Swiss-Prot record, chain A:
Membrane-spanning ranges: none
Family: Belongs to the herpesviridae major capsid protein family.
Compartment(s) of residence: Virion; Host nucleus
Function: Self-assembles to form an icosahedral capsid with a T=16 symmetry, about 200 nm in diameter, and consisting of 150 hexons and 12 pentons (total of 162 capsomers). Hexons form the edges and faces of the capsid and are each composed of six MCP molecules. In contrast, one penton is found at each of the 12 vertices. Eleven of the pentons are MCP pentamers, while the last vertex is occupied by the portal complex.
Protein name: Major capsid protein
Subunit structure: Homomultimer. Makes the hexons and eleven out of twelve pentons. Interacts with triplex proteins 1/TRX1 and 2/TRX2; adjacent capsomers are linked together in groups of three by triplexes, heterotrimeric complexes composed of one molecule of TRX1 and two molecules of TRX2. Interacts with scaffold protein; this interaction allows efficient MCP transport to the host nucleus. Interacts with capsid vertex component 2/CVC2. Interacts with the small capsomere-interacting protein/SCP.
Length: 97, 48
């Protein structure tokens, strides 16, 4: 059962108000682990703010950011609900393979 | 009007609905009220 996370993924990705900052941070990180770690707190704040004031996940358009958030943003400073949505995304990737 | 009369307003026109969905989506409205107008746009696309 990963259909709630995938419903949120559907709404996020098809929503026309997806924030432009995510494309910029995506192209500026381009898969670097240390770049994500240097930007880490900024990323968590964007995720929380856009989940609460919009109603959509953040950085879900790109594989690199989703994976980096799942792995490195799992300490805290990200509430467990958002973190578990990102975990379920990588777990869907793992299920298909 | 949603809180007092319990109705979403400006629904009578295509232009106000579309503009509310497009331009009142970076904050401004609470997410639920926004989602109603986004849903109206999605209904139009579904019919297409």
């Amino acid at each position: 059962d990963y259909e709630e996370t995938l419903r949120l993924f559907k709404t996020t990705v098809t929503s026309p108000n997806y924030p432009e900052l995510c494309y910029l941070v995506d192209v500026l990180v381009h898969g670097n682990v240390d770049a994500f770690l240097l930007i880490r707190t900024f990323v968590a704040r964007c995720i929380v703010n856009m989940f609460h004031t919009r109603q959509l996940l953040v950085f879900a358009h790109s594989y690199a950011l989703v994976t980096l958030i799942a792995e490195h943003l799992a300490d805290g400073a990200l509430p467990p609900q958002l973190l578990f949505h990102y975990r379920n995304l990588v777990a869907v990737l793992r299920l298909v393979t």
